[PDB]
Amino acid sequence: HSHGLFKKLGIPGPTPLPFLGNILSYHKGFCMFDMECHKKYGKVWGFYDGQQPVLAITDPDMIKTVLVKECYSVFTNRRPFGPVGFMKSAISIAEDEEWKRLRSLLSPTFTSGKLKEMVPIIAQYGDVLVRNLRREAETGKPVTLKDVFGAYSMDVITSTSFGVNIDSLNNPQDPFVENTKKLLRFDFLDPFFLSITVFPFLIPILEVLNICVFPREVTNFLRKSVKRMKESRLEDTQKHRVDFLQLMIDSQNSHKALSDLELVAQSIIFIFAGYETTSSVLSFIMYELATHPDVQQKLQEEIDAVLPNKAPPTYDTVLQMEYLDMVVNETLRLFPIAMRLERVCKKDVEINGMFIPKGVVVMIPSYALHRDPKYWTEPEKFLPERFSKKNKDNIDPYIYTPFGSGPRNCIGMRFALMNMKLALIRVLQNFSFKPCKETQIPLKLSLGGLLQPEKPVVLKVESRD
């Protein structure tokens, strides 16, 4: 019962109930709870996830000392979350020294160089998306974005980690599409995870019963999948391509190296971390564009000016589109799908005047901060202008953090950005998007612990001649 803590330190917050902490307050989701506390406790506050104390911070400098300055020594890990199994060694779950080794070994995977080399691969599935989406534009019945984009997203993950070239959308069956599909990001407000937070003592029990938040079904398949390919597939050499797996294998053959269990776990996590995030953001971007016909027109003019007569998109060409970048960034402001960044304080400290005791989870409420009236004129509005070179000097890099910051930010950032824009450039060269009847306006965020549409986005899709 650390419920005494925040008053003992003099830190404001809502009143915990015995056992539950402040969880009952999650009935309206992480984001709405965060915005409420901000409005009423000011710069910093505390609360309890069961008996787990969590201190929220909104100070640009404070946030930076945590994410940047003192990542290495004090604020290195995220909070443990459930029985994790062999995935305990995935880079985004790993901790302290184990984590640093992996971050180092996997860094070259996401180089500028290696990114450029993957353009021809992912571009090839831009084509396929178009081909596909076209079919629906003829059908004239409203499109489901999460489905069209999920396909695209899966298509791109598979190929860029050993080239498993599959049209997911039309191959509803293939063993490989089915397993991966089931790799859905976790809802830390579902019945299961709510119980884990209140009875965290129940975790070691589950670990001993070989139960795991990553279903046995999918991970088994994948290890046994990666199995055949990793050796006895490319054990014949020739036509070596660029993909995360080879990239990781190449460091397997001459604090170095990756084990045959650690490599399987990164492979899985990349999917987990990339699959639904990419597809979701892309839905939010298409939503914004359809409910803002103007911005879409502006965007299609830029694309056409840079890439005349449907010319195929490229690396250098993509880094050159400033309005595209603006639209992507605005969308992320409004829908920063991680919602919060979190670090566990490993030892007593004081940071710009405020003392953090060992064991507290320090939490930065991204969704809140992105909508804070202090930094944003018209917070709730979709306005890409906000991110023009003529203004970007006015956005604070520790208020706007859709991919986090410091040494433990999204290692897949440049790749996510490039991949998404590629999808957009090709989709927008060919079609336009339009609100439907079944389109929700204004859209409504879920009650869950995911940032996602309450009801999946469906839009009218019109071809360009």
Q: Which residues are annotated as a binding site for heme?
A: 410
Gap between the terminal Cα atoms of the chain: 66
**Which parts are annotated binding residues?**
410
How many amino acids of this chain bind ligand HEM (CB under 6 A)?
A: 24
Output the smallest distance, CB 91 to ligand HEM, in A: 5
How many residues appear in the chain? 465
CB of 255 to ligand HEM, least distance (A): 15
Sites for ligand HEM among residues 279-298 (CB under 6 A): 281
Comparing CB distances to ligand HEM, the nearer of 25 and 409 is 409
Please report, for residues 6, 42, 212, 271, 412, the alpha-carbon distance to residue 52 in angstroms, rounded to integers and kept in the order given.
12, 21, 21, 29, 30
For residue 334, the minimal CB distance to ligand HEM (Å) is: 12
Helices (H), strands (E): how many in the chain? Answer: 18, 9
| Among residues 26, 30, 270, 367, the one that binds ligand HEM under rule CB under 6 A | 270
154-213 positions binding ligand HEM, by CB under 6 A: none
CB 327 within 8 A of CB 62: no
Residue with Cβ nearer ligand HEM (286 or 337): 337
Nearest-5° Cα angle at 85, 55 to 201: 50
* Selected binder of ligand HEM within 29, 274, 384, 449 (CB under 6 A): 274
| Residue whose CB is less far from ligand HEM, 34 or 137 | 34
Which is closer to ligand HEM, CB of 189 or CB of 423? 423
Task: DSSP for 34-91, please give it.
Answer: HHHHHHHHTTEEEEEETTEEEEEE--HHHHHIIIIITTTTT--B----S--GGGGGST
Going by C-alpha positions, the residue among 269, 333, 288 that lies closest to residue 424 is: 288
Nearer of residues 110 and 323 to ligand HEM, judged by Cβ: 110
Least distance to ligand HEM, CB of residue 243, Å:
12
For the CB of residue 96, give the shortest distance to ligand HEM in the complex, in Å: 12
The least CB distance from residue 256 to ligand HEM, in Å, is 18
- Toward ligand HEM, which CB reaches closer, 55 or 410? 410
- CB nearer to ligand HEM: pick between 170 and 446: 446
R_g of the chain computed on alpha carbons: 23
Least distance CB 156 / ligand HEM (angstroms)? 9
- Identify residues 36-95 at the interface with ligand HEM (CB under 6 A): 91-92
Q: Give 37-42 contacts, CB < 8 A, sequence gap 24+.
A: 37/13, 38/365, 38/368, 38/372, 41/12, 41/13, 42/12
Site string for ligand HEM, 387-426 (x = CB under 6 A): ---------------xxxx--xxxxx--xx----------
Nearer to ligand HEM, 362 or 410 (CB): 410
| Residues 101-140, interacting with ligand HEM (CB under 6 A) | 103
The packing angle between helices 262-290 and 322-334, to 10°, is: 100
Q: Please say which residue, 283 or 296, places its beta carbon nearer to ligand HEM.
A: 283
Shortest distance in whole angstroms from residue 244 CB to ligand HEM = 7
**Binding segment toward ligand HEM, per CB under 6 A, in 122-130, 274-282, 283-291, 307-315:** 274-282
Stretch that binds ligand HEM, among 35-43, 173-181, 265-273, 455-463 (CB under 6 A): 265-273
DSSP three-state, residue 354: strand
Q: Is 163 helix (H, G, I), strand (E, B) or coil?
A: coil
Please say which residue, 270 or 287, places its beta carbon nearer to ligand HEM. Answer: 270
CA-nearest of 57, 61, 37, 43 to 396 is 61
Q: Is 9 exposed, middle or buried (0-12, 13-18, 19+ CB in 10 A)?
A: middle
What are the φ and ψ backbone dihedral angles of 56, each rounded to 5 degrees? -85, 140
Six-digit token string for 453? 């549409």
Q: How far apart are CA 320 and CA 331, in angstroms?
A: 19
User: Could you say which of 119, 164, 263, 273 contacts ligand HEM (CB under 6 A)?
Assistant: 273
Name the nearest CA neighbour of 425 among 330, 337, 336, 305.
Answer: 305
Q: How far is 338 from 403, CA to CA, in rounded Å?
A: 8
Give the angle subtended at the CA of 299 by the CAs of 340 and 332, to the nearest 5°: 0
Taking the complex as a whole, the smallest distance from the CB of residue 417 to ligand HEM amounts, in Å, to: 7
Point out which span in 141-149, 276-284, 307-315, 436-444 binds ligand HEM (CB under 6 A): 276-284
Binding segment toward ligand HEM, per CB under 6 A, in 9-17, 119-127, 168-176, 268-276: 268-276
Minimum distance from residue 304 beta carbon to ligand HEM (Å): 25
**Residues 317 to 356 in contact with ligand HEM, rule: CB under 6 A:** 337-338, 341
Which amino acid is it at 209? L
Which chain residues interact with ligand HEM by CB under 6 A?
91-92, 103, 269-270, 273-274, 277-278, 281, 337-338, 341, 402-405, 408-412, 415-416
